[PDB]
Design a protein around this ligand. Sequence first.
Ligand code: I7M
Lengths: 116, 116
Amino acid sequence: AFTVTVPKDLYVVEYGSNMTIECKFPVEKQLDLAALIVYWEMEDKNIIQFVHGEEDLKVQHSSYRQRARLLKDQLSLGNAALQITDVKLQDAGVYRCMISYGGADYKRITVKVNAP
Amino acid sequence: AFTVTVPKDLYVVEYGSNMTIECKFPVEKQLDLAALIVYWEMEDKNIIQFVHGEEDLKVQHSSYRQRARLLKDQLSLGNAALQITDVKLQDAGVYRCMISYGGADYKRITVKVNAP
Ligand SMILES: COc1nc(O[C@H]2CCc3c(-c4cccc(C(=O)Nc5ccc(CNC[C@@H]6CCC(=O)N6)cn5)c4C)cccc32)c(C)cc1CNC[C@@H]1CCC(=O)N1
């Protein structure tokens, strides 16, 4: 069965740092962007919404504006990595990386942000 | 945006009763099974896993074996209803109906089971 795996399910990060949460799914040979959906969420906040090759950044939650991106260079290797720059306390919570790619799976990642 | 809607996000049911949890998604004309993934879970228990029409009884969580199924009579109407027979206390929790169908969405539904 199509499996999403997270190499780390717990991130403990310093205030103001840059953080990359990895999220892996299998790709045989070539990645078919047209078949891929990548969704990143935290307490119902829309962080990343990659739908069949297209990203609507208008729907991203304001609290993540200019700080959260999906690293496309990784995607091609089956890593739907979320990078957050300038991490804030408002970023702490349970993240879910959800993938649809001929099959579907998701995993949780807890991020704890240390006090300044 | 592709939207999964739930006509009810809270069910309050009697112990030992039958329960249908509705979950609706848009269907334009004919249903394309090869494009449909429906998944129902609660507390990481795999309840329904319908992948392009394919289901595997072996992956269904044992506490729901023989009691839970996906209502197929109205998948063509866009209702991926989860039916549970002989509701038990351990059926109380937060359910997710996750649907991929030319796009992807999911909704949470809370079930509270009244004591007998
Ligand atoms: C979780 O185990 C599973 N899971 C499954 O299928 C699951 C996996 C994930 C997903 C998605 C999905 C995928 C990608 C993205 C999204 C998504 O885009 N979400 C989203 C998007 C937007 C919004 C906000 N709203 C926007 C609009 C506007 C207004 C409104 O109301 N909506 C909310 N949410 C979804 C949903 C879609 C169907 C189903 C599913 C399946 C087959 C099997 C399993 C079993 N695993 C076990 C395996 C073996 C061992 C192991 O480690 N793994």
